[PDB]
Amino acid sequence: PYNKIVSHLLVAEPEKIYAMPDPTVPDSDIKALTTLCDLADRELVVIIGWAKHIPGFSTLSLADQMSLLQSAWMEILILGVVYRSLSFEDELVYADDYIMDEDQSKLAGLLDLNNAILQLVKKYKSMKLEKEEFVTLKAIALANSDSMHIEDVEAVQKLQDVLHEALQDYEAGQHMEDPRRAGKMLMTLPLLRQTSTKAVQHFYNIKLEGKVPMHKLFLEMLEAKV
């Protein structure tokens, strides 16, 4: 009944992606990490194709489209993990075929990072984050990436406003009970930014340790000067 943009972001939402961990390979920290890094690489391919559907995004310069994605890709990834995990408890649904509980995490040396992601999960759980709000938030995070190297500053600000308006539209027509819901949603972006840069740093260290293999795209995003 509400926003055309929100409806459009709902249709553009990608189909499920799977982790596909090798049933034959025995479990270990490298199996898990190699798995997560493979899932991420494929995810990124999808994410980039998705961004083109965000209204006004593909009209920016190629350099700008790249700067936004280079700065927000991990936030878009984390948001997806968070949303898929709303219906669970103390577990992170990286994919339908790869759900990590506490132990699984400790063994992969990802306890701290995942606990951070669970902080996010907890907040959205209490707010009862709806799919419509989820897709709009992803687009907003991408647009509000805070990249240093932006060309057309005004065009990016306009993009942020367009998406921000769609979020207001949804919250006013669908959540009259809480006139402050849009703001509460926006107030969750900071923790998303925090957790994301932390995740990006952790996987860069894994990259340097060289014990875990990663594909070119996932590597390229980690490398990127952001």
Binding site: V45, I48, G49, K52, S58, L62, Q65, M66, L69, Q70, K216, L217, E220, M221, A224
Partner: peptide, 11 residues
């Protein structure tokens, strides 16, 4: 930044 540029330009 070549893969990103490529996947984006493709469309």
């Amino acid at each position: 930044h070549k893969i990103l540029h490529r996947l984006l330009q493709e469309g």
